[PDB]
């Protein structure tokens, strides 16, 4: 079964970055009133040039017109109760990152500007459409995603919460679940002047690319920072606090990409090692005061899609069963047996045993 269908739509002008329409995968499920709706990542480019590359190479994620009429469902997306003991009878959509802005743009094509960045936009026209499939009598929708849709979650869940209230759907909870999507903008491991931007120097590609994009953060947070710097409300610890909906975090403690972005490879010298313990040790900090999250000790990059997402366990619980926990919590405290705030408290990647094997 292919069981995620593609509508692309209605309004054709909410598009991907080359004009094509955006558009959203669904598996409707007509006896469950949950809905889950995945942002897709991968990066984002920040100035012509560095899009036009995005276009020769990535060209899925700049525009619809190769995309598949279906997908198969994996991980929290699998219909299939052994791939997904989470939500696997509920209503799914999957949103394909088709606007390389972590979803934050605001901004069309038009004569002036080739590529449009409309990933906010998508995301508030993809709600409403589905408000006709079924979302109308929803009481739970679960803005998921990762990587830069994991960030994307972060930049839209309170968003589409305010958007539902208003428009008269205050019985759906909105809750936000955010993987791979929490960095850290940390001083960089024997940092040199490389010429890949988004890795080389992350806060200035994001500012730039705001400035492209139109780009547009939460209120709260942007309210904060103020004009020219609201690339900080791109990082979870300082945009997470201001958020009004129940939000759970998924992070490696040590992610692909944080390591990439902070020069690191992996013997490893005392400098190096020192510096990967602190890294562990700062995100871990940083998630003390999120309720609910799942950060395991591993090297790794995403998991909610991914087939075998079942495997990893902090202290015995896995994340299927954290993310159940967490459901409990919010019928905002765990309950007996029931644990939602999962952070490995072992120092190196790897020293948890149920780590992705790569
Ligand atoms: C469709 O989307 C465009 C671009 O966001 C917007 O300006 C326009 O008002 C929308 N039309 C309708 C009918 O919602």
Avoid at 121 to 149: F, H
Avoid at 185 to 191: G, L, T
Avoid at 199 to 228: D, H, K, L, M, S
Wanted: hydrophobic share 35%.
């Amino acid at each position: 079964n292919e069981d995620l269908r593609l509508h692309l739509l209605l309004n054709t002008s909410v598009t991907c970055n080359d004009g094509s329409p955006a558009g959203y995968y669904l598996k409707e499920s007509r006896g469950s009133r949950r809905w889950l709706l995945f942002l897709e990542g991968g990066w984002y480019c920040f100035n012509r040039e560095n899009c036009d590359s995005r276009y020769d190479t990535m060209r899925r994620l700049m525009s619809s017109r190769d995309w598949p009429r279906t997908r198969t469902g994996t991980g929290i997306l699998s219909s299939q109760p052994e791939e997904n003991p989470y939500w696997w009878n509920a209503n799914m959509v999957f949103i394909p990152y088709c606007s390389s802005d972590v979803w934050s743009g605001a901004s069309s094509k038009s004569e002036k500007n080739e590529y449009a960045f409309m990933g906010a936009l998508i995301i508030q026209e993809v709600v409403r459409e589905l408000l006709g499939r079924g979302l109308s009598g929803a009481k739970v929708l679960l803005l998921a995603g990762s990587s830069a849709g994991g960030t994307g979650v972060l930049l839209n869940v309170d968003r589409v919460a305010e958007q539902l209230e208003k428009l008269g759907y205050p019985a759906i909870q909105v809750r936000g679940l955010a993987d791979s999507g929490w960095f850290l903008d940390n001083k960089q491991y024997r940092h040199t002047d490389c010429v890949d931007t988004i890795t080389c120097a992350p806060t200035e590609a994001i500012r730039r690319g705001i400035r492209y994009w139109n780009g547009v953060v939460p209120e709260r947070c942007r309210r904060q920072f103020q004009e020219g710097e609201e690339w900080n409300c791109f990082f979870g610890y300082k945009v997470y606090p201001t958020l009004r909906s129940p939000v759970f975090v998924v992070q490696w403690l040590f992610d692909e990409a944080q390591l990439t972005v902070d020069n690191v490879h992996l013997p490893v010298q005392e400098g190096l090692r020192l510096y990967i313990q602190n890294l562990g040790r700062e995100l871990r900090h940083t998630l003390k005061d999120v309720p609910a999250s799942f950060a395991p000790a591993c090297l790794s990059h995403e998991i909610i899609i991914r087939s075998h997402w079942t495997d990893v366990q902090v202290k015995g619980t896995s994340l299927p069963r954290a993310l159940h926990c967490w459901d409990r919590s919010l019928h905002k405290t765990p309950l007996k047996g029931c644990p939602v705030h999962l952070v490995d408290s072992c120092p190196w990647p790897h020293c948890n045993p149920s780590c992705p094997t790569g």
